[PDB]
């Protein structure tokens, strides 16, 4: 699936969830690979420089839909600000939104090449993995990687109240709905934004359930993979499994903060229209 994001007024971006998880997986697979032995720690510069080049490349492809993106932003600003006939206008949103999704599909093979180049690099690093004793492989790399890349993110989650955040959003949608049922082009605009807000909410709860589930799993699993040794084949399986958990967690965390901002930007417009409608009585 593809997620459209409007974090601020005038900006519109997208994320292909499968590609993000995929890129994230091979990033953490790459870091686990070099942090296993003290000798390869210094390789972080090259790994950092390669991931930066993969990301800058993927973005250059995204930017090829920029003219089709900007043409959709112009239509959105018209829809959200009906101040200087809704069905004839709603077609301009659909077609341009479809033209934007269609542009992204037409660059599928181009994005797939970059993802496959990151898969190649990540796998080739993972293959350089070796132990001093194949029956007694150290887990210092797993511990270091987690402490330096994942633990801070696990804390930011535990600090913030995602379940409360969801309920505050649930309270906005329910307060908006009873006010909405007082209409006697503006009511049709309010109906559309409210609908888009319920869709954003459902994506926010979906990712929140992934964040909470993956946070618990990671805290439980990490205890079992550190402060002990594994046989080589077991250590390799552990590294591949942990990275999958990290990628799903980091993707949902990333999408949640973006959708959270998308919800409150659309709320600002909803409140301005409601405020205009109440003033005119």
């Amino acid at each position, epitope marked *: 699936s593809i997620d459209i994001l409007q974090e601020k007024e005038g900006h519109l971006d997208f994320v292909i969830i499968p590609h993000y998880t995929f890129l994230e997986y091979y990033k953490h697979l790459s870091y686990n690979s070099i942090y296993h032995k003290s000798s390869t720690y210094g*390789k972080y510069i*090259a*790994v950092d420089a*390669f991931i930066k*080049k*993969i990301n800058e*490349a993927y973005d250059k492809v995204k930017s090829k839909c920029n003219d089709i993106k900007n043409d959709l932003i112009k239509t959105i600003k018209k829809l959200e600000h009906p101040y200087d006939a809704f069905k004839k206008m709603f077609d301009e949103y659909n077609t341009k939104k479809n033209k934007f999704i269609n542009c992204i599909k037409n660059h599928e093979n181009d994005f797939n090449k970059i993802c496959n*180049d990151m898969k*190649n*690099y990540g*796998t*080739n*690093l*993972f*293959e*350089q993995l*070796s132990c001093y004793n194949n029956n007694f492989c150290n887990t210092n790399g797993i511990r270091y990687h987690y402490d330096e890349y994942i633990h801070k993110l696990i804390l930011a989650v535990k600090s913030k109240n995602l379940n409360k955040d969801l309920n505050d959003m649930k309270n906005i949608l329910q307060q908006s709905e009873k006010l909405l049922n007082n209409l006697e082009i503006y009511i049709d605009t309010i109906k559309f934004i409210h609908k888009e807000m319920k869709h954003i909410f459902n994506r926010i709860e979906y990712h929140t359930k992934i964040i909470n589930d993956k946070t618990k799993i990671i805290q439980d699993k990490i205890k079992l993979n550190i402060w002990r040794t594994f046989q080589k084949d077991e250590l390799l399986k552990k590294i591949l499994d942990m990275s999958k958990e990290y990628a799903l967690f980091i993707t949902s965390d990333h999408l949640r903060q973006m959708l959270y901002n998308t919800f409150y930007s659309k709320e600002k417009h909803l409140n301005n229209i409601f405020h205009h409608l109440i003033y005119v009585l």
Partner: antibody
Amino acid sequence: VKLVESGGGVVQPGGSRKLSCAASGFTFSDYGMAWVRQAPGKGPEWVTFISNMAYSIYYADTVTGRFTISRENAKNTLHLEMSSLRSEDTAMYYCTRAIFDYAGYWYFDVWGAGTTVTVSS
Amino acid sequence: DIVLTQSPASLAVSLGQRATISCRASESVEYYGTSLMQWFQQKPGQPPRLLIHGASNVQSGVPARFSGSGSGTDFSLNIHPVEEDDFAMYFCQQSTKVPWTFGGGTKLEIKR
């Protein structure tokens, strides 16, 4: 740091042959491995490649479906099973060690002395 | 497939001079800011010997008199000053796209 190929000789057309390469003076599992061949009076032709744990296996279009690369890491050995051999397969077959550069690429830094395969009736 | 064309096919030089060998790829050999061009040396009845790998990175143990330059599609091997040990065949090789291809070779010969 040495690579030594074995198994070369005269094979009849349509016949089969297995080549071996023994590695020494380094951790064999630390490297990608490849076979490169050189036809009499010609330049080198890359045949096949195998990554450290055999996750990547590549073949030149000239040998695909006829040749099979494999490695036995505990034995420090690289293998090449060749089948339905033709006169065009007559060459010096080299075993070469591949290094994965952190800029994201493979390069061949150590080569063996080679073993000749002559495909003739 | 990426075609590598070496120029000249044969080059004759005297001891102490500069030998410049050119390699031109049909497609770009760039891979995220790195040109994946290798240079090899080969003497009769001997295997190839790696000289340069990152279009520019001199192999450990390879004398400083060897250098590589270029990017994208145009590459150069420089030997300065040429010594007796250097008369051999030189091949460029790309590791950007499979099949990994070599050039046709340039023979470095002694002028007499």
